[PDB]
Assembly symmetry: D2
Homo-oligomer: 331 residues x 4
């Protein structure tokens, strides 16, 4: 007798299990930039949002839902409880705590571990077979933490790692050459952020190695100072923090790009953080960025990049420092 | 020579104008949501941002730029100076002061009018032939204002109006019926916000009028209280503001939708605010939302919705109220 | 070591059951138009092609594969053997002969029924839980045939039906009003092709019913002869056959649109052909087009369009003719 | 007052010109593949079709028009007369004779040059400012011809060239390495034909040079015979032609990729047919493919690829062969 029943005849009310569901944990600026970019790329048939701040969480959910007319993602849900995350193919973690003035790395990392001790087991409960994509900083250590806590095989725990660093690098490279960043190739690997390593040998347009054309490239004897492109990648990040307080759009776009490869099983190669034990003479359980093949199983393969001695030593130093912190952590 | 000259043999120097340039004025949450949505829909070959807060502006510009690898908009610029906006096809105004503790509505309006007194002349100067899309509140008044100051013909001055209202209506309608909002048709017209008017006669799925099936629809005696759907539209806005402090994603997406029709000359029909003088017995210079055809020269046509007497009287009261404020405004 | 093994370290080998797979059966002009449209809308992670002409099938597969760089569908396969179709979510049948000179109605149908007796079991064997979307003509009858042979519930057997008829109608309607077809709403229902029914009561822009503004809409004495729009839909089809020999692009696009709603569980409403027994005084097992909600489980719901006496009689007359052929078929 | 006048109020008439008009000359298999690819990528606000066969032309136009509901290109036009092509930003030429099974593209010169003597002046007459994108075979030679006839500066005369050959190369390379072609980098330059040159020295994944890992790469001594990958690229057209009579989908996608860079001023790098005078000691006005930066002024820059001695010798052989043909041509 109702209006819905006058208007619509139902053939059946079966099942309803999402096929391409994504969860974002943490609805700060980063989380929401991930959400919007993922929504506008039509990657998911369901999106779930989780946070501990319940008002903010509900408000962000509602705001996205109100744009449903202009999207092709028919179900957006949110909640403090992880039942809303059930059956996710991909779970993206941006949650964590902010470092404070004077706080040690060890103490900041330990705080995030304690946070992950609540997040990860509940993610796993409701999506045992998902891929985990860790964005929270320090991303290389927290990828390790998520791997450790989740018990997932290595291929399904991915750190955003040097994906943002490389995108920034390619942007700057584009600007200098007057070429779209898509056609400017170059890889920043190792530890995300301050200690990242630009691999000068790979820097190229149309297969033409910039290093080969200009052997001083990357060295201090370069009159054109191409090393500065990498230094401006790092300066860029501090500047964006200083100017707007946080970074959101670029990270969100980059994470959506990782999600596309994973959700559509593309097997594209991205610079992301993976268990690096057994490479570059690293013998500890540490995660660092190398180019990885990303698809439906997460990281199925990785590329073995030939590094100069200086590049190797820089990754190996990063690995030593990360393990130094990691081995003092309490799970 | 330089590495660049070793790599690249140039045929042509003399650069052209961007051909599909958009400017967003005001990089608050609304402006930046508009921006990301426009970038991800590939509507512009250049995007300009303007604000008066210089640090924020630069920071937002850089953050977007850093995502360039994942976009197809080759030039993103910003500045306080409107020379960065030159030759825009479309300028979206989201700049606004927010109402302060104890401030009256009239005084709030007047402060936004003062902001437009500076913005509009600057926009006109550098893009004399653009379309103006006004989002800033109160949107119906501020669209009138923008029209009056710019001296543009009414086809090139468009207020976001009831676009968001209608999008929200259709999301709720879709949730009630279990149908994607794209296939749920309903129009909210008139004054944006609290005083907006749901046109129950046009509410339909698949051309099957809900009012024809359920004559009580939209009345107090409606046994199923479908009038609450519009109540919830208005409640939603207050709740989102209560929960997260502002709205961004939905308005950003709805503005990109308008921008698409305009930039791609689609001639789709949208509920936006336009000069209504001479319709529904309204005789004052006021802007209210009706379904308009949007394209290359802005609003080329409007659809003449058959309204009930009650419906007309509601638009007329909105018009009287808006005109009443407008004649006390200092230009 | 192979170059591959020197370049790439493998973490695990594969290989998940297909997750978002579509099959197209019949790689003639319609089949291949569907394929390219599906490929360009990023709806599948694997596309399989089947035909009985083996070289042609291989050539079409390779031509698509050669475009792989510009696509986001990582696996394209084909073969005469239906093992290439395993674990498809959606199987689109565009296989068949065409209406011959001299040959009646019942004989052409029977030649396609014979084709279907081989195709359908093979499809069902390798994708027992797929949705079937039938395009082959006469489409309403062959959808029935697919349903009977497959043994699938009715929600999982969909005929393209009046999806194309309705697109053409809205294209013509938009040409008349100077408005994009997306904003020009109108439903062509019933039997696909010559005997389809334009539902004048639903024809509207922005929920303004044209029948209400112009009560002569669709009648003989209409001074503007709007019945010609529908007559032109039918004439258009005959004209394209006369001019070009076949139709491909419009049907290709229409099908991709249906696939989009199904693959993404959108629950949009489309005019497609479904088992209509129990409606409009119809008491035989026939498929006719009504507006259906399309999603991951095919047709979950249909909209109950109010039809005038004449409209209703035209549907019943189609149903009789359709059943009169169907009772005579040999399975 | 007609129904239209009752429904729609006009603010202003006067027709505007399109902003992003594209023309396709020849509505054969290639032309129409180009069309559908361009339409589905939203590159144009007007598409114009031209051919000498008037019935096929109109039929193909109509078929495209009938899919308008599913597109975002509001106007599609066709005609024998080049007045339909006026104001084109980009004009794509796909008209003329194609290869029979086993036939060389170089056997098409007399036929297709004589066709170009009528087509090109007509195109230039109505769109004197357009970019020309030549697809008709033999493409490198006809790009030279189009340049000589048109009197355009060479930046605005672009041959589709080896974009497709490189796309096929990267697909094949992708299959061998288990990586998406987008992440497999490798260039095939020179003639779009038998004399094309694979640039082994530039092939890489994630900037890791395959030649450094595998010094015999591409040589006769190669144990994995990677030269066979190039051989397959050379033979591709013949193989597909033998199987399905012609090739269409891959070139359609290739052409749309090129059109995107041009129309959206991306400045991406693509191997396209252009004048290579001044590189590798070539003095002749020969057109063949090298990587070019493509944008709104067409080819703005050439990338100077560093070729090995053997690579460069092969490219010069290609240039000699093509120039022997080009230089005998009479205008
Ligand atoms: N990998 C990379 O390249 C980049 C990483 N980041 C990192 O991303 C993280 C997030 O960035 P922002 O959004 O700007 O910080 P934020 O502090 O604004 O957002 C964090 C959110 O996580 C939530 N949260 C905290 N504990 C939670 C819990 N136990 N369960 C669920 N949610 C919880 C907070 O309530 C908050 O909403 C930071 O760690 C940041 O450093 C940022 C940029 C780039
Ligand atoms: N039409 C609609 O449906 C909706 C309209 N709105 C309106 O959008 C406007 C903006 O929203 P928010 O981003 O949340 O406000 P906001 O206060 O966070 O941001 C406004 C920005 O405008 C800038 N601005 C102020 N004066 C300026 C000037 N003279 N030149 C350039 N920039 C200037 C501010 O500096 C600030 O960055 C408000 O008026 C709001 O009411 C919001 C939601 C929906
Ligand atoms: N529902 C609609 O609105 C429309 C339906 N159609 C129909 O689509 C069908 C096909 O159209 P065209 O591509 O133009 O026909 P076509 O004759 O060019 O191609 C048909 C293909 O089916 C193949 N085929 C035949 N037997 C087969 C089998 N046992 N297994 C697999 N494949 C087999 C043929 O080899 C051929 O490649 C026709 O029935 C046509 O009437 C066409 C336009 C619109
Ligand atoms: N550059 C590349 O990678 C590729 C180039 N091709 C070439 O594309 C060309 C066309 O191939 P198809 O479309 O398969 O051939 P098609 O035979 O299917 O169609 C060619 C069209 O050209 C038209 N035409 C002939 N003379 C004309 C004139 N004077 N003005 C306007 N139109 C005219 C014909 O009427 C016909 O419709 C051939 O030269 C072919 O070799 C084909 C594949 C790839
Ligand atoms: O932008 C960011 C904001 C924030 C930050 C931390 C430390 C210093 C500065 C900024 C968190 C991040 O990890 C990035 S990303 C980053 C951070 C430092 C250096 C380089 C990068 N990067 O991605 O290129
Ligand atoms: O959501 C909004 C945030 C903000 C607001 C103002 C007043 C009250 C509540 C909220 C500004 C706006 O104009 C909208 S949009 C809006 C606002 C009020 C009522 C209805 C709508 N709407 O679009 O449906
Ligand atoms: O375009 C078509 C080509 C072909 C055809 C059959 C019968 C007569 C004419 C043409 C097959 C089809 O099913 C249509 S679709 C069609 C066919 C006839 C009338 C109306 C339509 N239609 O979809 O609007």
């Amino acid at each position: 007798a109702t209006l819905k029943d006058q208007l619509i005849y139902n053939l059946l009310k079966e099942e309803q299990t999402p096929q391409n569901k994504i969860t974002v944990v943490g609805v700060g600026a980063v989380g929401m930039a991930c959400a919007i970019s993922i929504l506008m790329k039509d990657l998911a048939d369901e999106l779930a949002l989780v946070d501990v701040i319940e008002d903010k969480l509900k408000g962000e959910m509602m705001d996205l839902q109100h744009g449903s007319l202009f999207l092709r993602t028919p179900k957006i849900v949110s909640g403090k409880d992880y039942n809303v995350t059930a059956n996710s193919k991909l779970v993206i973690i941006t949650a964590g705590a902010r470092q404070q003035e004077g706080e040690s790395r060890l103490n900041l990392v330990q705080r995030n571990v304690n946070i992950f001790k609540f997040i990860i087991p509940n993610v796993v409960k409701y999506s045992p077979n998902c891929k985990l994509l860790i964005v929270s900083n320090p991303v290389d250590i927290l990828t390790y933490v998520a791997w450790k806590i989740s018990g997932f095989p290595k291929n399904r725990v991915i750190g955003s790692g040097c994906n943002l660093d490389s995108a920034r690098f390619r942007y700057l490279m584009g600007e200098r050459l007057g070429v779209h960043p898509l056609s400017c190739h170059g890889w920043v690997l190792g530890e995300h952020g301050d200690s990242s390593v630009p691999v000068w040998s790979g820097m190229n347009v149309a297969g033409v190695s910039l290093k080969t054309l200009h052997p001083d490239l990357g060295t201090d004897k370069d009159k054109e100072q191409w090393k500065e492109v990498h230094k401006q990648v790092v300066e860029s990040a501090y500047e964006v923090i200083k100017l707007k307080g946080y970074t959101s759009w670029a990270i969100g776009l980059s994470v959506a790009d990782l999600a596309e490869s994973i959700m559509k099983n593309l097997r594209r190669v991205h610079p992301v953080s993976t268990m690096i034990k057994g490479l570059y003479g690293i013998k500890d359980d540490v995660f660092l960025s190398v180019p990885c093949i990303l698809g439906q199983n997460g990281i199925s393969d990785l590329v073995k990049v030939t590094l100069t001695s200086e590049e190797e030593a820089r990754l190996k130093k990063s690995a030593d420092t990360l393990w130094g912190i990691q081995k003092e952590l309490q799970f």
